[PDB]
Amino acid sequence: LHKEPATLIKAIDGDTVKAMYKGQPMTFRALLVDTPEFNEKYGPEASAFTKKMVENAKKIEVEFDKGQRTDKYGRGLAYAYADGKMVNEALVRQGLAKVAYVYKGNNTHEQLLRKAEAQAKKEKLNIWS
Ligand SMILES: Cc1cn([C@H]2C[C@H](OP(=O)(O)O)[C@@H](COP(=O)(O)O)O2)c(=O)[nH]c1=O
Numbered sequence: 001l002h003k004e005p006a007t008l009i010k011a012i013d014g015d016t017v018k019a020m021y022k023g024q025p026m027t028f029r030a031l032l033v034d035t036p037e038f039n040e041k042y043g044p045e046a047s048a049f050t051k052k053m054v055e056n057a058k059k060i061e062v063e064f065d066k067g068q069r070t071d072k073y074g075r076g077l078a079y080a081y082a083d084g085k086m087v088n089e090a091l092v093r094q095g096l097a098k099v100a101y102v103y104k105g106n107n108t109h110e111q112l113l114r115k116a117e118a119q120a121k122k123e124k125l126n127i128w129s
């Protein structure tokens with residue numbers, strides 16, 4: 001896979017961010033994770049985690065997988081990186097997202113993220129507490 005440039009427009013919630021990609025605004029939905037909705041327990045925490053991460057980064061980057069690049073809502077499906085650190089992985093390692101929506105053909109980082117989730121569950125963090 002390859003990392004491509006993007007510029008943060010707004011953090012939206014734990015697993016969606018709006019960003020400028022190839023010069024057009026795009027809402028990105030993080031591959032392979034599911035944060036709680038803002039109205040649910042750990043929703044506000046997930047939202048603040050991802051917001052801090054992307055807003056504090058000197059750059060963000062998006063990396064598409066091998067399969068679908070857009071979902072049925074028009075959202076970009078990507079792994080997002082904040083100064084080289086993957087947001088998707090970080091959320092799962094902190095117990096603020098579950099590994100989810102793992103579709104054949106769009107699951108390059110599945111094992112990386114399942115390992116993180118095992119660690120968060122072992123440490124009883126957030127969702128897992
Ligand atoms: C993460 C992801 C979500 N989606 C779709 C499936 C779900 O459809 P449904 O809306 O019909 O439930 C929805 C979940 O996103 P949210 O968790 O942002 O609600 O997004 C994909 O199609 N591919 C993906 O890789």
Ligand SMILES: [Ca+2]
Pocket residue numbers: 015034035036037
């Ligand atoms: Ca969600």
